[PDB]
Each structure stands twice: as structure tokens, then as C-alpha cells.
């Protein structure tokens, strides 16, 4: 019995708590570029411990 905003804020807080903040542009960035640039490439090799 939580609100829709409370539910997505809980999901986003879990994502912020368990994803390191240097690869978010490799997942969430989607918008068309007018200026030349590169987003984050992503994580190179996977970790073998579930965070």
C-alpha cells in the first residue's frame, strides 16, 4: 500500500544503493545528441560477488 511515486523512489534508491555511480550513462542514457560526445562504455568485466 505505497504510492506509485513511493514505489519507484524505493526502486531507484535500491538501484543507487547497489550500482556504482560511474556507469549510469551506460544504462539510462537514451537521448539524441546534437553535440559530439561519448557516453559511458559500461563495466568491462563482471564481478563474481552479488552486490
Amino acid at each position: 500500500d505505497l504510492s506509485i511515486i513511493s514505489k519507484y523512489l524505493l526502486i531507484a534508491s535500491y538501484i543507487c544503493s547497489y550500482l556504482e555511480p560511474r556507469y549510469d550513462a551506460s544504462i539510462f542514457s537514451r537521448k539524441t545528441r546534437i553535440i559530439q560526445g561519448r557516453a559511458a562504455y559500461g563495466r568491462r568485466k563482471k564481478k563474481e560477488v552479488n552486490p
Binding site: 555511480p21 560511474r22 545528441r33 560526445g37
Partner: protein
Amino acid sequence: TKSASSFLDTFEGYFDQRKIVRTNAKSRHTMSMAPDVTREEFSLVSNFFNENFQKRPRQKLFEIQKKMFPQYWFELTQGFSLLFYGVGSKRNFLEEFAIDYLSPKIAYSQLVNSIPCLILNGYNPSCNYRDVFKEITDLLVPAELTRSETKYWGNHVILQIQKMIDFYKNQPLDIKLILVVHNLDGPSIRKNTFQTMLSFLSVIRQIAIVASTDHIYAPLLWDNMKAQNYNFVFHDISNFEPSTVESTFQDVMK
């Protein structure tokens, strides 16, 4: 130092501006290369620019904002607390609205002295909630707690305000006190006990609440219960005012 980022706004700009700068790409520029400025010339140039730069548009804008004063009065008579926000100082606006306008209107409509206005300087870090409630108890003379109402090492201020809420629900709905809170998100008034005290006072229909906020994250202070008790109507009043009174408690040299 304009960023070499493709994006400026939203989460796109947030993720695009938080990238990694190399050591050779950083600038080792310090404050020692800045021109030396003493306190007196700082004061002189600031009071010159704060009294002559963009003064006429600020004056005309302020004359537009007092056409909102009857609507503010009407929102206060229906039980809503006023929250003002914007860019610049709102202190002169709040005292001019509450003292020169609102208190004579409330006093004349309730027909001989005017309504007392209790001012809280929340920009002052020494703003103390117990002394504010001491002034409130002198202004309103509430009934003291009996022995069963003191509970067991309870907070006497909060219990007295709850007794006040239960008392004032069966009174005529005439405003007896105007509580002006400059900088409701200030350094000591933003604490949980002060906010709880002020929201429970905002429950009482006989106290008019006119508050202002300066921090960009001020609505984080209020949960569902405090938003219900505060009963805010929000009004954006941006004026680009100097805010020289509130700057006396910080050090401008740093």
C-alpha cells in the same frame, strides 16, 4: 570553464557532466591570484550595488506583488498556511505584508489594538524553539498541563500544544496571532522538533502562519503528516533581493 558535455539538463545532463577529469586536464588556479579585497570596500561596493543596480525593476515588480495581498489574506482566513519561495530575500516582503497590511485587515474585520505579529528569524542559528514557545504562551495564555497530561518525562511543549489544539477546536475562528517565520528552512529551525512544533501550531485555525524558505531542497523536510498539518499554499515570489540581513550570520571573507 564551460563543460565539454553534450547535455545540460535532466538526468542526461547529470550523467554527462559527472565524468572523470585527468590530472593534467585540471586547473591548479588558487585564490592567491585573486585581487585582495578588505571588509570595508566589500561593504561599500555591496551596499552601492544592492541599492542602485536593478532597483527600478525590483520596485515595479514589488508593486506588482502587493496586488496578491488580498488573495493571501483570503487564503489565510480559510486555514491555509502561506509558504513563500523564490530567488532573493523575502524578509521585507513578509514584514510589509504581515505588519503594514494583514494585521490591520484582520483586526478591522474582527470587530482596540491590532493583532500581534510574532517574528521568527530562522536565518539566525540561535533560534530556539523553547523560547519561541515561551513567547507564544505569553501571547496566548494557554491552560497549563495537569498532572495526568504531563505523562512520564514527556515533552511539555508538544503536550501543551496538543492540549491547545484540543482547546481551540471549540472556539470562534478568529485569528489571535500572526506567526511570521523568516527562513523556515534555516539552520536550527529545520530540525525535527522545531518543524513538529510549528506544524502542530499550524493545525490551530486561530494562528496565521506566513513562512518563507530559501533552500532548494526544503520540501524534503515535510512528510505526509507534516504536510497535512502545515496545509501549505505555495506562492513563488522571486525578486532578486540582496539578502544583506541574513548574510550577517555568515562570513563573507571565506
